[PDB]
Design a protein around this nucleic acid. Structure first.
Ligand SMILES: Nc1nc2c(ncn2[C@@H]2O[C@H](COP(=O)(O)OP(=O)(O)OP(=O)(O)O)[C@@H](O)[C@H]2O)c(=O)[nH]1
Ligand SMILES: [Mg+2]
Ligand SMILES: [Mg+2]
Lengths: 125, 97, 125, 285, 65
RNA sequence: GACUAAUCGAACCAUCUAGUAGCUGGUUACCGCCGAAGUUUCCCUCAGGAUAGCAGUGUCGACCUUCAGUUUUAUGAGGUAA
RNA sequence: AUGGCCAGAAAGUGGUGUUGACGCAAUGUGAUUUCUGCCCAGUGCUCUGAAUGUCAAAGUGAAGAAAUUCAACCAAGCGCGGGUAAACGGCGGGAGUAACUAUGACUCUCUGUAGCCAAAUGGAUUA
RNA sequence: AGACCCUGUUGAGCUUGACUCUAGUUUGACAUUGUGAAAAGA
RNA sequence: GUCCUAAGGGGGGCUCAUGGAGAACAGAAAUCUCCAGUAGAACAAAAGGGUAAAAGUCCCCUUGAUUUUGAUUUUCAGUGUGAAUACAAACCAUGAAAGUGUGGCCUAUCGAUCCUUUAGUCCCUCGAAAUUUGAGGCUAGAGGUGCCAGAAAAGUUACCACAGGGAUGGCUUGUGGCGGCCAAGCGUUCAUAGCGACGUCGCUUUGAUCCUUCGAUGUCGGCUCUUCCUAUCAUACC
């Protein structure tokens, strides 16, 4: 055959030479799977001979960042707008809505439901 | 597909988000917002600074006539030349394809 | 499988089993798996904590302990006949015999226990 | 492209999913009759907005070599061409050239009848506004050939000439002019091009009564030489792209009237005939 | 921001899970990840959907989604 | 991963062998004269280095030249009070 | 049986073996009762079926004065191309067609108060 | 001087397309290797 | 080595290179005036027909340096409020307006004391001598990760072992946060701003409903028994 070494395996699979690799890749392990399994092994800091943390664990940095918001014209504009024709169409849509047990909801549509849902009954109000 | 695109696809390198790649950063020491590159960018920091300390070894190794005020422009020009060389190689390979 | 196809964008679908105690949730998980992977007992409250079972590569089953929603119209007799409680830990179990005799036809009781001719539950017992 | 203006020009000339309206280049040869020039003027008047006009003499014979035509298409970004020529054999010739990817897709010759030609100025009627599209009527049995021939090619070429700009909506006031091309199968059949203005009258019903009045020009053609497309180039040109606003239909995935994504499940028929109930002691007689 | 959630039955615990200790907004149609692949834990009791929003010009405070 | 002479995730005996440890512990009279130090500058970091600076014994050279964590004078910065 | 499974540094060496498929050796499951979700063909299992595509040593040819260099040829295995323990694995169905073989692809639409059928019983709620 | 935590130029047992090797197995060539034929080449 | 409120977009005004005739210094060549000037200038590209009340050149406005939304396109997603991307729409800029226009361009990295490669005739040595190949040394050149080589030495131990090192505080208690207003007073009265208790106003079921319980990293107990505090449940008094 060709060989069971990782060099021969990469030559057989036609990897571009010179690419970096993540430590632990083999026939059964790709880079994504290695990352997924190393997540389970994360969580321990690096300590010196006296136990003082010299490198913090994952997402435990203890470094205080600069929490600043830049000036931007996008903060003062309308993110979502809707027209009256579209509102009337959606009101007619809820007017003609029926319930079907064999249909499931997969992704809700972000809508201003307070302007589309019909009002409460007059006795309740 | 260019060389970077093929390398990123093989290595699982994800594209940077539009917020991440913005030309804006917050300078702590001045307490102001500044650009990373371009006109008055942070990559040319200190070229208009009135006072620049220079090391004696680098000043002695510096050629005559050149000043410290153009070192960052020299580095930027070298990086731009390398990037454009890679772009032209990618364009030539795509033209052959 | 149809639900998994509708949610093919995710890595999995998770199916949680809910209901009253002793309705057969763990038995349904074991039957779908084809193997005794969840504990099954005729005593209510066999499953005490939630449990993950891998059915297929993209399907998970979640076993849950049995719940009884509190209702002010529910009686201890109704709960005991629905199977909430263990009859070993109840006081005076003979008071629930007339409810059983009302629920079960008389000839079914007679044919089950090979005994006939009682006028009330005390004489039957 | 250094300047943003040159970048805009290159982006406009770049291939797109939704193509721009086609541009027609009007040009003439070394010799060209006055009747042919008048016909080119009438066609340019009908297609002013999306046309460019040359004014010199070009030493081009299109059915011998079309490298100059390809170069002109490359430079002017013109995908249709009207080429004028005169000759002893062919006194009044309009050569319709259709391009694809700056190369000649197909060509057709029209021979104009000089005695029956009438220009737009010879009719004293109200004319078509600049930029407004006319509607089209193709009449006769010559356009229904099962094999692709010169008449089907001429029908396609005249449709591409008089398309204008596509639009999803049109005002009812933009339906006042009609271009009619008439041709019958058979000695050579005559392809007759006429333009009419449309008037409407009461008829006592909901629909109006349409009456026509001639607008000009009055053109009579005999179909001449024909250069057909290569099959591979024709297939690539007749490929249709799909816009991003055309959703790819997924199985059991739909959009409701509120915009929610809805999935459909299929339970199947419940067949409990193969189920044996538990043979309990109280059910055994 | 995060605290370490310890897992395992040994005296030495695995510490890869992180719990979010501040209020969060999880959005509509939210389904939690499986516990084997849930690194960041956003607890249900800290999830919010509405806010008391004040308009500086109209001088009105309204509860809004 | 049980047992294999109270010895078992590899028995006991002798030897190589005074094996190796950067880790732990210890390291033996007196008096006299001096006597300290913690990014200064460079190098990929931690499981990193040199190096400046501070010291002691000797000497040698005309131990010659004088210099000084100080003030004043002239001139800068601070024109800031007034 | 000029075999399999082993052992030994080797041996004119040893065991199984005073053995021969109702046997030997290696696995998995673990009395009886119940019992094999549906359908394949990606990993794998095995096919001397055509290839020289890769192709070691030895051998062959050419050039050089020789050291040497260059060429073909090139076993097994790999590769290519076939059938599966279809074990692992994947697997929402059912119809069509214009593709025409793999992969298709493009449309359509899917929701008995104790019976019947099975060689007394319908069971794992197993003594 | 247990246990638990932390550190090591840490030790050892174990696993796997981790690296370098290797027992076994498999394939080719050379020698052991002799006597005649029939064809195909050079 | 210097300089710039960046480029871009929109709108408006003007016409260029050159030649002739003229004007103190000024004289081929400074500046200004007129006339003639199809662009022979400038800006882009590589016309065989680019642009003239402009696509050239000066003013005015924006300079906000890469907007928002999408059930849609493509790719991806063990961090699935999806991201990147394409398209569309909205917004935005400018203009009286018709309109015009923007909301980026790219790219693996690592050596240069490195890698590859060339020449030496009159360079040196091959140590018994010479010649021809060859090899080494030394010197001098050339190019730069397409044609300049290369860059793949993992885990586990709850079966264990050894050398060591370890094991906020005169805090807390009974009365929410954000936003606005009022406000005695403090300041200020060459500026009339700024602080500000007491309060107040907005958000957070006609005695209903019982068909909405929203995540253990942090661990407590029980027995026996003694004492103390008061922030008092009972008993005593008010
Ligand atoms: N006859 C019959 N009995 C069933 C069936 N399914 C379940 N059972 C019985 O019902 C009992 C309850 O089964 P479980 O799986 O424990 O149900 P559960 O609701 O999960 O019980 P808990 O774990 O206590 O909540 C079991 O002992 C079964 O014997 C069924 O389909 N038919
Ligand atoms: Mg259960
Ligand atoms: Mg139960």
């Amino acid at each position: 055959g060709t060989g069971k070494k990782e060099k021969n395996r990469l030559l057989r699979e036609g990897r571009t030479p010179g690419d970096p690799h993540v430590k632990g890749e083999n026939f059964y392990r790709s880079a994504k799977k290695i990352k997924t399994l190393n997540i389970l092994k994360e969580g321990k800091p690096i300590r010196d001979s006296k136990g003082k943390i010299v490198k913090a664990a994952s997402f435990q940095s203890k470094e205080v960042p600069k929490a600043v918001i830049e000036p931007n014209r996008k903060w003062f504009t309308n993110t979502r707008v809707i027209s009256q024709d579209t509102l009337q169409s959606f009101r007619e849509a809820m007017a003609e809505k029926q319930k079907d047990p064999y249909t499931v909801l997969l992704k809700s549509n972000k809508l201003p439901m307070s302007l589309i849902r019909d009002g409460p009954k007059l006795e309740d109000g | 597909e260019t060389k970077w695109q093929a390398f990123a696809r093989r290595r699982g390198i994800k594209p940077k988000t539009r917020e991440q790649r913005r030309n804006l950063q917050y300078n702590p020491t001045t307490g102001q917002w500044e650009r990373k590159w371009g006109y008055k960018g942070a990559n040319k920091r200190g070229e208009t600074d009135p006072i620049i300390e220079v090391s004696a070894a680098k000043e002695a190794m510096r050629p005559e006539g050149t000043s410290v005020r153009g070192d960052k422009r020299r580095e930027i020009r070298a990086r731009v030349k390398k990037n454009q060389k890679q772009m032209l190689r990618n364009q030539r390979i795509a033209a052959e394809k | 499988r149809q639900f998994s196809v509708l949610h093919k964008d995710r890595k999995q679908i998770s199916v949680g089993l809910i209901g009253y105690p002793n309705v057969g949730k763990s038995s349904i998980i074991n039957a779908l798996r084809g193997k005794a992977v969840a504990k099954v007992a005729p005593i209510p409250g066999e499953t005490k904590v939630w449990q993950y079972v891998t059915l297929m590569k993209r399907i998970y089953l979640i076993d849950c302990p049995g719940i009884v929603p509190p209702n002010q119209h529910d009686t201890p007799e109704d709960l005991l006949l629905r199977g909430v409680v263990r009859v070993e830990n109840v006081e005076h179990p003979e008071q629930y015999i007339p409810a059983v005799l009302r629920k079960v036809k008389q000839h079914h009781m007679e044919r089950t226990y090979e005994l006939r001719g009682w006028k009330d539950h005390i004489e039957f017992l | 492209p250094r300047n943003a203006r040159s970048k805009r020009a290159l982006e406009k000339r770049a291939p797109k999913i939704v193509e721009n309206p086609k541009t027609c280049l009007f040009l003439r040869g070394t010799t060209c009759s006055q009747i042919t020039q008048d016909a080119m003027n009438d066609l340019y008047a009908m297609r002013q907005v999306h046309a460019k006009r040359f004014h010199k003499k070009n030493a081009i014979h299109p059915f011998e070599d079309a490298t100059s035509l390809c170069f002109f298409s490359e430079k002017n970004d013109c995908s249709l061409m009207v080429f004028g020529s005169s000759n002893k054999k062919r006194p009044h010739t309009l050569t319709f050239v259709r391009m694809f990817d700056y190369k000649v897709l197909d060509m057709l010759e029209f021979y104009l009848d000089p005695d029956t030609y009438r220009s737009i100025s010879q009719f004293k009627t109200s004319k078509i506004p600049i930029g407004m599209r006319p509607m089209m009527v193709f009449a006769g049995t010559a356009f229904e050939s099962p094999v692709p021939n010169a008449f089907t090619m001429a029908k396609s070429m005249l449709i591409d000439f008089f398309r204008g700009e596509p639009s999803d909506k049109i005002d009812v006031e933009g339906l006042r002019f009609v271009v009619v091309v008439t041709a019958d199968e058979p000695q050579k059949p005559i392809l007759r091009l006429r333009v009419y203005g449309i008037r409407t009258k009461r008829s006592g019903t909901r629909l109006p009564r349409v009456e026509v009045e001639e607008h000009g020009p009055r053109m009579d053609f005999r179909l001449g030489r024909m250069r057909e497309p290569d099959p591979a180039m024709l297939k690539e040109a007749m490929k249709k792209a799909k816009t991003p606003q055309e959703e790819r239909t997924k199985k059991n995935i739909s959009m409701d009237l509120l915009g929610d994504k809805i999935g459909r499940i299929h339970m199947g028929k419940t067949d409990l005939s193969k189920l044996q109930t538990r043979k309990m002691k109280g059910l055994k007689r | 921001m995060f605290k370490v959630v310890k897992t395992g039955k040994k005296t030495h615990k695995k510490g890869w899970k992180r719990i979010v200790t501040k209020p969060t907004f999880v959005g509509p149609d939210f389904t939690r990840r499986p516990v084997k692949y849930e690194r960041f834990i956003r607890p249900m009791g800290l999830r919010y959907k509405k806010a008391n929003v004040t308009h500086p010009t109209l001088n009105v405070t309204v509860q809004l989604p």
